[PDB]
């Protein structure tokens, strides 16, 4: 799917925000509410937003792409929300 710009340019930021979160958790083993909580709540809401957006996009209709949906649809998790 690298050809199409939107899906690529959204999965990339899905990975990059996860990089930032991985950094935040990596910082300390002690609990961190030192603005980490604020950006972390922002992060979970934003990641839910973009993940559900790409879910809507997934749902040439190639079998691999359409079949990949039902892994997540097993729980119906993002659609139910």
């Amino acid at each position: 799917f690298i050809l199409l710009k939107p899906v690529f340019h959204c999965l990339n930021e899905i990975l990059d925000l996860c990089h930032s979160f991985c950094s935040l958790v990596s910082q300390n083993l002690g609990p961190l509410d030192e603005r980490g909580a604020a950006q972390l709540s922002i992060l979970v809401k934003g990641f839910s937003r973009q993940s559900s957006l790409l879910f809507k996009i997934l749902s040439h209709q190639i079998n691999s792409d359409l079949a990949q949906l039902l892994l997540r649809l097993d729980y119906n998790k993002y659609y139910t929300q």
Binding site: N63, S64, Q68, L70, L71, L73
Partner: peptide, 12 residues
Amino acid sequence: PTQVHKSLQRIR
């Protein structure tokens, strides 16, 4: 290989 994804579809 092509049937494994369809298998998980069916298990769902």
